[PDB]
Design a protein around this ligand. Structure first.
Ligand SMILES: C[S@@+](CC[C@H](N)C(=O)[O-])C[C@H]1O[C@@H](n2cnc3c(N)ncnc32)[C@H](O)[C@@H]1O
Ligand code: SF4
Lengths: 435, 694, 603
């Protein structure tokens, strides 16, 4: 039936910008230089995925096996899975560990003993463990041509980036080591190569007021340059061993009141476009690890109650999921290239059962499989044959309006077979059709 | 002169079908390590020699079976260098290989068997191989020259081959390959072209194991898959007259409720003058359990007799199970790379058979150091563990001769990879792993009892996996980055550490106190990280060599007349320096860099004496402590390719140049430790003990 | 998107009172303009002219402040000598309530007119309440007091040292721009209501004297002429450079003099001196140069402080002008029974088209862009034949005709307000009478040169109707609808009856066998044949006798006109910022619009 999520973690290391400035990002706890010994960056060590990883001694095979066995024993025995890689800049490491990690992670599916990543995926595509995608987190100065190619080779579908703010002074202050234009370039390259970007934003950064937050989020959700496909809300927390704790001890920094936070979250989640999903709303850190901040992790229901009391009703994808549905199409310009978003909406009770995203190749897209004059289907999803209908509409739009000759779709290695019943071939990691 | 290898320590690769046991009397074991195949005699406890012929990892081994129940001593090995090789021994030393041509893909499993064609006088064997590009290819032998009979592109796309099995049915060769989804392909040749006889399909999931057998007139085909089912077909046929095959299905079992990586029958052995082949099926599942199936139990149920294995410790099971000479002892291959042997000993419930299985590192060995007096040896490797070997002098109650060597303890199971190591006491040692600190481990009192028991029974696998750890005592903060090289003092008073550095701020050598564990000095001259550095035999000097192609004799007051000396140089070498060594009389010191130019410097001015070029780059240099009356020196250098060269240096050619072994090391050497006889370690799981006699 | 267009235009010529005008103000509830003049002169001459001229307390030759109260029933004036004099016109009373012997450079008032502050000529700033008594005073100083975790010659040749002062829409903060003489540059700083410094200005390499604040309270404008180009930059509330947009003019040949915002924070007005006045707007962070107006010397400009989209201009020749504006798209829909639809959009020196039958295109993208040298001013499509478009530019009144590639024809050789198009070659370009304010319809048709004709009519015309199939014109007045005006014959103004309120949007539709009149006003009231049906209509569309309306309450409604009768699933709920754009008759493709800048298609 449903798909069970599998989470992994990497080995501890140092973020790449420490060699130039001399310190890591201010608000980030944990790591090799913190009291949380043998814990990766941006993590304490007391979280489910975290202690499973640390008791696995950080090897993909063992922890994948534990997760799969536990989920199977629970009484589900799912068919598809989706990997998630967590913790630190995954491609700041030497390529040898990257290759070893990904190849062993893929081999842990059925049992092959691949010597290299190529044969690893070429054998994984023939498995019964229908893995549909892998997610990788990367910072903007390490999302470039080579890094994007490496992404595509491992067969990942979505990637996550942390911008956390749209003001240059905040980047200069918190010592991120990269200007805000890097976020623009990273979004441009990632979006014009078939990937689905989900971004990270935090309320209540240092030296950021309250009205400035709503203004920056309005700029975020209205400016074509900064429109993401997925929102990652993370309230700011103060945790020892970081520059933020040093500031907070001297009485400089301060945190929002509970009611102010509830109202701000309600306002932000009220202005989210219907085509944007909200992955995470709160941080996963337990109670006693954070000194000041939200001390209760049920922020979802409080925000929903505040919105209900307010007078605005959410249109997020998370709450708009499962008498006749109808095809609705939306358009907008994001990151410098015309897009389109098709769905099957039920405006009676305001839900949906099927959706699809399509985008025209903007210009000078380096990915040779595209080569210009093509279209990309960034995601398809079905709930519960609507999929072939959505593909029909997408083909019609590609042929008629875009004026394209070839079309391509990104798919996980476990589903590239499902696009063969339609008449697609394989070029690179894409399924390809001619118009 | 002479150069004999006393002992080696190795470990099988993690492929499914890595080891194979010979049939009949005097069975023999052969498995694979990083780039080689290692032999092993179960009767004894010693390794004879390795078949160093490959360039990549070796993934399949198979004995060429001899029909008349006699030892064969010819085998086939397929590697990850796109190479299938046929080897002939007929003895304990004959190393003759054929080194067939490319397969275009790393093979996973192969097979071979004798044709049994007497009409053509002595008949020969044939080989069927499958690879990454989903093809099956036939290689035959008809004497000295190999025969490329035919090629068969098994499929075109990603329709792979899961296993392979060979046995002639009655008169003609028959091939049984595996198609991933559910299928088993049974082929047959007319004259030389193999044409598809039939394809069987009864498995819901991926098929993993396929095995032949013969009983009376009926062939037997055993198979095991991932669908919680073990599937057997008794089969009576006639060879294709153009006739076809007449397969029969039978009852199945409910074994292990998990994946089954391997399954096997029982071979035929010579006893009381006749050949016996019992009806036995033995599996190798993943739930750390193994079931001894029995034939029909006089009714057809085929129920077991005892299932060995406890689900407690390891849930990842095994990759192989094979027989001894007969139904006496059964061997299995663990997931992590260890072996497990069981013996019955005239009793129906079987028990373990320890003290026989050889064990070694399953990841590259980085460093080792000799015992202070010569009792044991300690090795560290990138498998996140440390291992301790010591010889067994408590040999059999009547056989006290031929002392062997066995691993004794697993002190630490760490969470990083270990890079540097030094010994500070008989029962204490310091290790620097990937962390920015150093750790110190000392022997407990629960170890010395068994140590004196065995070195004045060797531990089992479980005892090493659960109950051999050494408690930690110390922790050495003070570095910023990884630790690259450490040294030690003659009298166990001073330490010397160096951290992985890229600038001149972190390139500072740090000295410590053995008694108090406190930093007392910090020297800084080198522009980059110090790759190696060593004390002199006397405390008058301390030499260092770094990656900045320059050396430094930079020593100052310990502060715990001058009791040190300093001198440096601008540049002499052209590439990164690797090794530095001293002399027994402290009169000369030797440096060897990657540009394979070993240079001596004499004991102000520090000029050279002569330069020497070596066929390959150097990675380790050591000098024999024992002097010679003719005022000469002995150097034993270890190179990148896996070779050791012994030279004699004479004061002012006149330098000995010809002393080196063959079949020495597959991959790079890291260090060479003389005994105060020397030991060699490498990046290919190989640690060996040598001997020189002159 | 939408495009501004001209509307009811007003012009007055009262009389040449003493000397010249300096600064004026608008009185809302009594609807008049009061002007200050040198030689002590407050004249409420405009409108019915209840003129009350008084001699203000020789003296200084300039007066800086003139402001209505509308609650204390007086007008406050201040002169360059620093004499805040409360005066009431109905009684001819004078009193120097406030006076400082230093001088006054500028006068400003709170949005709610509760507090005020003055800039003395001795480089100090003082703050008073309604009672003209000083409560606090500071000067220009350094040491911004570490707000936030933050803590050569570069002056313009023509820079004026007079400081500028602006307030915020909600009346919580006010910004002051002055000159620093130690470094010879420009500086800005923000103060709160309780009159305490809250921020400063970062270092900038060359800034002008202009200043303006968005009534929404988000941004602040400035000049910042670059070494290579010339820009208009923004300063957020905490005083940092955040965004900018570039003027299309050349280096060292123009200067900026003023910046303004309308009442609803949706139109930006800019004053350029060599002179031009331009109105812009914001799409998706793209600044559309909507309209331009070139004038030869203008004394002052003023947005209407009560109703949006109304500008007042005072010139040196004793000329006073008032202009209105309209907010509606330029659609080509209803062109023919054929399945046709597309929209035109004005931007800078070009026009962006979106074909909605064969494509769907978001605002910043386009299909068939068209470039014109001078800025364009208006566009329009035909009645029944084809979809060729006529465009008028705001520079030389040249008409350019585009054939629907894109065959072009134009004359090779303010006024011209409504250029209605009749298919063959016909331009209907209404106008107004100077100093008499009466509508003057025209009849202009195309080495061919444009030739016009002149006819007259009483009344003020609000908005022409659309010439439907084989139909002549139709005009709106301030009350009712008249002047059927047969196309080929100047005709009478008989009724087709009496608008309750002049509808903002209007149309005539052949409902069944009867030609009915439809309209929609700012009250959201939807009027049919002088009947109020519903009071919650935001946008409307009619085609193939189907009406489509927006309930403004989260619903879009459809109702057939086949029965030619209506009176206050089928419905389909919609989000908040809905606004209907062109429709397809057969495909029933209703294109809905949201405020963020995207589209939506619903069948
Ligand atoms: C698991 S991290 C994402 C991985 C990592 N931050 C990266 O660079 O991709 C999720 C978010 O937590 C944020 N974060 C880090 N430290 C935090 C803290 N002390 N309180 C709240 N959020 C924090 C990061 O900025 C990031 O956007
Ligand atoms: S780069 Fe990301 S993970 Fe690393 S310190 Fe900065 S915020 Fe934390």
């Amino acid at each position: 039936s449903g798909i069970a999520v599998v989470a992994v973690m990497c080995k501890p290391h140092r973020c790449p910008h420490i060699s130039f400035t001399g310190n890591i990002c201010i608000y980030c706890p944990g790591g090799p230089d913190s009291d949380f010994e043998y814990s990766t960056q941006s993590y304490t060590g007391y979280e489910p995925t975290s202690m499973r990883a640390i008791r696995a001694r950080y090897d993909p095979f063992l922890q994948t096996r534990h997760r799969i066995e536990q989920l199977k024993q629970l009484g589900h025995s799912v068919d598809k899975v989706e990997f998630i890689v967590m913790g630190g800049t995954f491609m700041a490491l030497p390529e040898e560990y990257r290759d070893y990690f990904i190849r062993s992670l893929h081999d842990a599916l059925s049992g092959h003993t691949s010597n290299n990543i190529h044969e690893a995926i070429k054998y994984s595509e023939r498995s019964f463990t229908k893995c549909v995608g892998i997610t990788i987190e990367t910072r903007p100065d390490y999302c470039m041509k080579r890094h994007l190619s490496d992404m595509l080779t491992y067969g990942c579908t979505r990637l996550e980036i942390g911008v956390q703010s749209v003001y240059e002074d905040v980047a200069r202050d918190t010592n991120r080591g990269h200007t805000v234009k890097a976020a623009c370039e990273s979004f441009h390259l990632a979006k014009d190569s078939g990937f689905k970007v989900v971004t990270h934003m935090m309320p209540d950064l240092p030296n950021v007021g309250l009205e400035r937050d709503i203004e920056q989020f309005i700029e975020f959700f209205e400016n074509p340059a900064f429109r993401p496909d997925g929102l990652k809300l993370y309230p700011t927390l103060v945790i020892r061993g970081t520059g933020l704790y040093e500031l907070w001890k001297s009485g400089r920094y301060r945190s929002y009141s509970p009611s102010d936070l509830i109202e701000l979250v309600a306002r932000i989640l009220a202005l989210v476009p219907p085509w944007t999903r909200v992955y995470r709303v709160q941080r996963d850190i337990p109670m006693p690890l954070v000194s000041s901040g939200v001390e209760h992790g049920n922020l979802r229901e409080l925000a929903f109650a505040r919105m209900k009391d307010l007078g605005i009703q959410c249109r997020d994808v998370r709450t708009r999921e499962v008498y006749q549905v109808e095809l609705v199409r939306r358009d907008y310009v994001a990151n410098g290239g015309w897009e389109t978003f098709l769905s099957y909406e039920d405006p009676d009770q305001d839900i949906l059962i099927g959706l699809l995203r399509l985008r025209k190749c903007s210009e000078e897209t380096f990915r040779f499989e595209l080569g210009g004059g093509v279209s990309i289907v960034r995601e398809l999803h079905v709930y519960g044959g609507f999929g072939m209908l959505l593909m029909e509409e997408a083909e019609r739009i590609a042929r008629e309006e875009h004026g394209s000759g070839k079309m391509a779709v990104i798919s996980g290695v476990g589903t590239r077979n499902y696009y063969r019943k339609i008449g697609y071939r394989l070029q690179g990691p894409y399924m390809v059709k001619m118009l | 002169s002479v150069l004999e290898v006393s002992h080696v320590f190795c470990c099988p690769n993690r492929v499914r079908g890595a080891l194979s046991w010979n049939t009949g009397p005097g069975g023999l074991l052969a498995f694979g390590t990083s780039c080689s195949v290692v032999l092993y005699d179960p009767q004894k406890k010693v390794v004879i020699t390795n078949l160093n012929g490959h360039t990549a990892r070796v993934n399949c081994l198979q004995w060429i079976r001899t029909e008349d129940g006699s030892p064969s001593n010819e085998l086939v090995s397929g590697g990850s260098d796109n190479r299938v090789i046929h080897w002939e021994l007929e003895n304990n030393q004959v190393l003759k290989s054929v080194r067939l041509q490319g397969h275009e893909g790393p093979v996973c499993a192969v097979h071979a068997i004798y044709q049994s064609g007497p009409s053509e006088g002595e008949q020969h064997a044939l080989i069927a191989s499958a690879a990454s590009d989903s093809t099956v290819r036939i290689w035959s032998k008809k004497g000295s020259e190999v025969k490329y009979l035919q090629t068969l592109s098994f499929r075109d796309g990603f329709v792979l081959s899961v296993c392979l099995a060979i046995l002639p049915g009655t008169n003609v060769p028959v091939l049984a390959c595996g198609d991933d989804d559910c299928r088993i392909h049974l082929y047959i040749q007319q004259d030389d072209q193999f044409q598809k006889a039939l394809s069987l399909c009864g498995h819901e999931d991926w098929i993993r194991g396929v095995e032949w057998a013969t009983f009376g007139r009926d062939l037997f085909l055993a198979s095991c898959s991932q669908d919680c089912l073990i599937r057997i077909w008794r089969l009576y046929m006639k060879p294709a007259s153009f006739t076809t095959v007449a397969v029969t299905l039978e009852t199945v079992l409910a074994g292990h409720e998990n994946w089954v990586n391997a399954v096997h029958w029982q071979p035929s052995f010579y006893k009381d003058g006749v050949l016996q082949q019992p009806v036995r099926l033995l599996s190798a599942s993943m739930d750390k359990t193994m079931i001894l199936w029995a034939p029909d139990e006089e009714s057809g149920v085929w129920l077991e007799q005892v299932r060995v294995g406890e689900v407690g410790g390891n849930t990842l099971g095994f990759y192989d199970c094979q027989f001894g000479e007969n139904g006496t002892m059964i061997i299995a291959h663990a997931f992590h790379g260890a072996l497990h042997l069981w013996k019955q000993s005239t009793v129906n419930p079987r028990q373990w058979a320890p003290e026989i299985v050889i064990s070694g590192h399953f990841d590259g060995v980085q460093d080792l150091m000799w015992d202070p007096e010569g009792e044991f040896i300690i090795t560290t490797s990138t498998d996140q563990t440390t291992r301790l070997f010591a010889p067994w002098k408590k040999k059999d109650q009547k056989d006290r001769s031929q002392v062997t060597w066995h691993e004794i303890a697993r002190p630490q199971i760490h969470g990083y990879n270990i890079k540097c190591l030094a010994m500070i006491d008989r029962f204490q040692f310091v290790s620097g792993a990937d962390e920015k600190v150093l750790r110190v481990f000392s022997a407990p009192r629960n170890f010395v009892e068994n140590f004196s028991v065995i070195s004045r029974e060797p531990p089992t696998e479980d005892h090493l996996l659960q109950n051999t750890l050494w408690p930690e005592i110390q922790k050495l903060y003070g570095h910023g980055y990884e630790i690259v090289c450490v040294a030690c003092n003659n009298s166990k008073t001073l330490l010397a550490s160096a951290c992985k550095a890229s600038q001149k701020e972190h390139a500072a050598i740090i000295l410590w106190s053995t008694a108090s564990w406190k930093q007392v000095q910090s020297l800084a001259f080198h522009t980059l990280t110090v790759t190696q550095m060593t004390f002199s035999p006397d405390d008058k000097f301390l030499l260092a060599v770094s990656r900045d192609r320059t050396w430094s004799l930079w020593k100052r007051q310990d502060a715990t007349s001058l009791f040190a000396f300093t001198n440096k140089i601008t540049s002499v070498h052209s590439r990164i320096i690797w090794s530095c060594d001293w002399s027994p009389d402290n009169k000369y010191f030797f440096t060897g860099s990657r540009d394979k130019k070993v240079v001596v410097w004499g004991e102000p001015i520090r000029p050279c004496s002569s330069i020497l070029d070596v066929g390959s780059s150097v990675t380790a240099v050591s000098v024999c402590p024992v002097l010679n009356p003719a005022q000469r020196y002995i150097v034993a250098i270890g190179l990148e390719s896996g070779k050791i060269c012994i030279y004699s240096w004479n004061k002012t050619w006149t330098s000995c140049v010809e002393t080196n072994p063959s079949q020495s090391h597959s991959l790079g050497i890291r260090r060479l430790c003389w005994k105060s006889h020397f030991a060699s370690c490498g990046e290919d799981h190989t640690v060996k003990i040598y001997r020189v006699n002159r | 998107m939408r495009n501004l267009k001209l509307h009811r235009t007003l012009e007055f010529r009262d009389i040449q009172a003493p000397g010249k005008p300096q600064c004026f103000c608008l009185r809302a509830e009594q609807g008049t303009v009061l002007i200050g003049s040198e030689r002590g002169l407050t004249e409420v001459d405009p409108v019915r002219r209840e003129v009350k001229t008084e001699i203000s307390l020789d003296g200084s030759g300039c007066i800086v402040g003139i402001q209505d109260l509308l609650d204390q029933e007086s007008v406050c004036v201040a002169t360059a000598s620093g004499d805040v004099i409360v005066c009431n016109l109905s009684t001819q009373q004078l009193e120097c309530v406030g006076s400082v012997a230093s001088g006054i450079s500028v006068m400003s008032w709170s949005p709610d007119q509760e507090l005020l502050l003055l800039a003395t000529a001795q480089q100090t700033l003082i703050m008073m309440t309604k009672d003209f008594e000083v409560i606090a005073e500071e000067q220009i100083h350094q040491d911004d007091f570490g707000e936030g975790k933050f803590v050569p010659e570069n002056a313009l040749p023509w820079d004026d040292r007079r400081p500028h002062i602006t307030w915020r829409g909600d009346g919580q903060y006010f910004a002051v721009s002055v000159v620093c003489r130690q470094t010879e540059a420009r500086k800005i700083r923000v103060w709160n209501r309780e009159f305490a410094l809250q921020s400063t200005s970062e270092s900038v390499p060359g800034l002008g004297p202009a200043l303006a604040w968005k009534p929404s309270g988000s941004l602040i404008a400035s000049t910042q002429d670059k070494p290579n180009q010339q820009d208009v930059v923004f300063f957020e509330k905490n005083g940092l450079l955040h965004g900018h947009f570039t003027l299309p003019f050349l280096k060292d040949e123009v200067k900026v003099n003023d910046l303004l915002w309308n009442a609803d924070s949706s139109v930006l007005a800019i004053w350029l001196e060599d002179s031009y006045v331009q109105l812009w707007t914001v799409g998706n962070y793209h600044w559309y140069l909507k309209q331009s107006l070139p004038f030869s010397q203008i004394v002052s400009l003023l947005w209407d402080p009560v109703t949006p989209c109304r500008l007042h201009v005072l010139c040196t020749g004793w000329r006073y002008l008032c202009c209105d504006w309209h907010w509606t798209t330029d659609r080509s829909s209803g062109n023919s029974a054929n399945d046709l639809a597309n929209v035109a959009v004005i931007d800078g020196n070009r026009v962006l088209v979106t074909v909605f039958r064969q494509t769907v295109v978001p605002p910043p993208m386009c299909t068939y862009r068209l470039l014109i040298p001078h800025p364009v001013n208006q566009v329009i499509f035909s009645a029944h034949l084809g979809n060729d478009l006529a465009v008028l530019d705001a520079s030389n009144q040249i008409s350019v005709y585009k054939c629907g590639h894109l065959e072009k024809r134009y004359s090779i050789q303010l006024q011209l307000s409504f250029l209605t198009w009749v298919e063959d070659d016909t331009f209907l370009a209404i106008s107004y009478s100077h100093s008499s304010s009466q509508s003057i319809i025209h009849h202009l048709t195309v080495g061919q040169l444009d030739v016009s004709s002149s006819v007259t009519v009483d009344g003020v015309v609000i908005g022409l109707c659309c010439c439907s199939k084989t139909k002549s014109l139709a005009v709106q007045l301030a009350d009712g609808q008249v002047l059927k005006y047969l196309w080929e014959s100047p005709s009478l103004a008989v009724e087709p009856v009496r608008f309750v309120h002049p509808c903002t949007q209007m149309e005539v539709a052949t409902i069944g066998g009867e030609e009915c009149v439809l309209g929609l006003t700012d009250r959201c009231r939807f009027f049919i044949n002088d009947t109020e049906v519903a009071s919650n209509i935001t946008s409307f569309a009619v085609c193939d006798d189907f009406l489509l309306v927006t309930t403004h309450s989260h619903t879009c409604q459809v109702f057939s006109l086949s029965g030619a009768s209506l009176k206050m699933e089928i419905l389909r709920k919609v989000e908040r910022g809905s606004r209907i754009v062109t429709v397809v008759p057969q495909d029933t493709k209703l294109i809905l619009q949201m405020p963020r800048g995207n589209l939506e298609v619903v069948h």
